[PDB]
């Protein structure tokens, strides 16, 4: 009835990803040097 | 097991009598066996690509009968391009048929220079036009380093054919992929059929083959 009727997990406090070029360097090794299927469940299953 | 030639040309290719594909093309001999090319193209020099897959339906008494039509191109990036289509109840079988048909039909591509001559040819010999359905294409030679100014679909065909500089214009309903690919294929096919002042030389015919 009340509008916004449709409208909390603790935030994963982890070290920030590097900023600037260092971020660019991360993806370069992420897709080539490091073993990857980008975004499927099985990849996320492995990382846990 | 082993490939048994079913044609005179096939048997001749089985033997070493014919040594190059240009020796077949120069007499307009049709190709009916996929082995006639792979024996001339053993290494992975050529490359296959799937362009578009479309589903077609036929209304019947109880529901529709569905099928798939596929389009495939092949080329070595050295003056050779092919294009074919196939249809079947299964997607993979249609892809195989399209690949076989693309391999079967192939044509050489003539390449030339823009203004200055130096090194190997890099662009089409002259202006080439093609037609299919409502789609017309224009290929204009470009200077070295100009890249390929074309849509993503046509650019793939140009890259496979082995052309690095060219200006393109498309007219008609270009969103119909098969007709655009056919238009560019026909334009490329016409290349070795235009007479130029360099080819005016009068050569006497040879009785052999």
């Amino acid at each position: 009835t009340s509008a916004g009727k449709v409208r909390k997990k603790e935030k994963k406090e982890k070290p920030r990803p590097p900023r600037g070029r260092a971020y660019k360097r991360l993806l370069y090794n992420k897709n080539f040097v490091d073993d990857t299927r980008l975004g499927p469940n099985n990849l996320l299953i492995r990382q846990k | 097991e082993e490939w048994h030639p079913s044609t005179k040309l096939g048997r001749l290719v089985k033997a070493g009598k014919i040594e190059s594909l240009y020796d077949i093309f120069k007499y307009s001999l049709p190709i009916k066996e996929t082995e006639i090319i792979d024996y001339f193209f053993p290494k992975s020099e050529l490359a296959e690509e799937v362009c578009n897959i479309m589903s077609v339906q036929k209304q019947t008494t109880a529901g529709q009968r569905t099928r798939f039509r596929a389009h495939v191109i092949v080329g070595n990036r050295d003056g050779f391009i092919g294009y074919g289509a196939g249809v079947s109840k299964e997607v993979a079988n249609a892809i195989k048929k399209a690949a076989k048909n693309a391999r079967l039909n192939i044509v050489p591509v003539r390449r030339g220079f823009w203004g200055g001559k130096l090194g190997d040819p890099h662009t089409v010999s002259s202006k080439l036009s093609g037609k299919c359905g409502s789609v017309r294409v224009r290929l204009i030679p470009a200077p070295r380093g100009a890249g390929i100014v074309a849509s993503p679909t046509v650019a793939k065909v140009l890259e496979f054919a082995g052309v690095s500089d060219v200006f393109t214009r498309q007219s008609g309903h270009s969103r119909t992929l098969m007709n655009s690919v056919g238009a560019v294929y026909n334009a490329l096919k016409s290349s070795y059929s235009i007479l130029t002042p360099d080819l005016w030389k009068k050569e006497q015919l040879d009785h052999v083959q």
Partner: protein, 138 residues
């Protein structure tokens, strides 16, 4: 052919183009002037008015409001985008209203709506939706 092509025919081609360029709908809309006089915004990116009434194949009631432009005094209808944003809008309140994506034509399944609310009481609606700003002054 079907077009004049003589060497001394520039005048005829000029007048032909002048007459025939008026048949395009967009060109007429842009360079005729009727649209300019009819458009409530009078060619502005957005305007300022006052709220006077909160009102409502997809079957989804939408929340909107009636506005009266200050500089022009005419009445229009505006739509409140976000979820639960109607509460931030009170009767007899000053708002800033802009247009939709399409200039003039209606957007989406909303019938006869061409304006959007973006600021209320001097605070961005989207900012209030994310709690960046607050309306405790009102």
């Amino acid at each position: 052919m079907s077009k004049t092509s003589g060497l001394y025919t520039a005048r005829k081609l000029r007048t032909v183009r002048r007459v025939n360029r008026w048949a395009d709908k967009k060109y007429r809309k842009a360079h005729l002037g009727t649209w300019l006089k009819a458009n409530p915004l009078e060619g502005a990116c957005m305007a300022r008015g006052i709220v006077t009434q909160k009102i409502g194949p997809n079957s989804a009631v939408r929340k909107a409001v009636r506005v009266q432009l200050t500089k022009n005094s005419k009445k229009i209808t505006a739509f409140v985008p976000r979820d639960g944003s109607i509460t931030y809008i009170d009767n007899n309140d000053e708002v800033l209203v802009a247009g939709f994506g399409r200039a003039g034509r209606a957007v989406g399944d909303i019938p006869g709506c061409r304006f959007k609310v973006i600021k209320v009481a001097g605070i961005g609606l989207l900012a209030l939706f994310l709690r960046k700003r607050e309306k405790r002054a009102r």
